[PDB]
Design a protein around this ligand. Structure first.
Ligand code: B66
Length: 247
């Protein structure tokens, strides 16, 4: 299983937020830690993406763009998996040192989004998503958001995305002789993948609004994140960059 061996091999390890859990919870501290954790994960998402089969085929400018557009969604999906495996969806496992209970979900002012991610977390269990399906679905997520005006080399991207879908087909067919069974599974997985997008959108909107008023609530945005929120996120929010839904 060359393809799956690679996905397993490059899967990022544990990333901590550096949050002070000995301090009473506050909006400013919780968000600063989410921001810092976001940036720490981006470092790994970039290394992960660049090590993915065929990613180098993409034009250099498209590589960066795709990573930045998919950043939020990729983190959402992996976070939901961690919440399921580590705490059976009882809380949201953003990081070992940044676990959200309902109180934190509320204090962060991201309650609706957190609840949707908890539901996603539960879905991993309800649908009995295997670790290999998770890995392949997450890679596919990276190739699920593009600009209307197109990428520099759209054809290369279309080929790569198609190949990742084919790998998902193979993983689904592995140990499934009945085509009907494969079809139902593909339906379930693509429906689950689609559900990630609306969640990332709510987080993008929240993050955008927060940055614009950051100086009013004492929230610290890392240099890199601020740039991406001000340059890339608005393209998504204004409809210039859109997710590719299956349904
Ligand atoms: C509020 C914020 O810190 C904003 O972080 C951003 C994350 C991504 C972008 N972006 O443009 O792709 C912008 C901002 C945040 O949502 N941070 C995090 C940090 C870690 C994780 C994880 N795991 C998550 C997520 F995805 F679970 F919501 C969110």
């Amino acid at each position: 299983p060359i393809f799956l061996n690679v996905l397993e091999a490059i899967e990022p390890g544990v990333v901590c937020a550096g949050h002070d859990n000995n301090q009473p919870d506050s909006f400013a501290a919780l968000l600063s830690s989410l921001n810092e954790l976001g940036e720490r994960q981006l470092v790994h998402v970039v290394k992960w993406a660049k090590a993915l089969p065929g990613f180098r085929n993409l034009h250099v400018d498209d590589q960066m763009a795709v990573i930045q557009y998919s950043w939020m969604g990729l983190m959402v999906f992996a976070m939901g998996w961690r919440s399921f495996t580590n705490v059976n969806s009882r809380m949201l496992y953003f990081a070992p040192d940044l676990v959200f209970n309902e109180y934190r979900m509320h204090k962060s002012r991201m309650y609706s989004q957190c609840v949707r991610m908890r539901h996603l977390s539960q879905e991993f269990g309800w649908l009995q998503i295997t670790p290999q399906e998770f890995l392949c679905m997450k890679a596919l997520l990276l190739f699920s958001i593009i600009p209307v005006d197109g990428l520099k080399n759209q054809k290369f991207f279309d080929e790569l995305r198609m190949n990742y879908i084919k790998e998902l087909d193979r993983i689904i067919a592995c140990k499934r002789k009945n085509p009907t069974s494969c079809s139902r599974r593909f339906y379930q997985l693509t429906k689950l993948l689609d559900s990630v997008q609306p969640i990332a959108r709510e987080l993008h909107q929240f993050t955008f609004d927060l940055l614009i008023k950051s100086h009013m609530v004492s929230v610290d945005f890392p240099e890199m994140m601020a740039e991406i929120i001000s340059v890339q996120v608005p393209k998504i929010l204004s409809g210039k960059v859109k997710p590719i839904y299956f349904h």
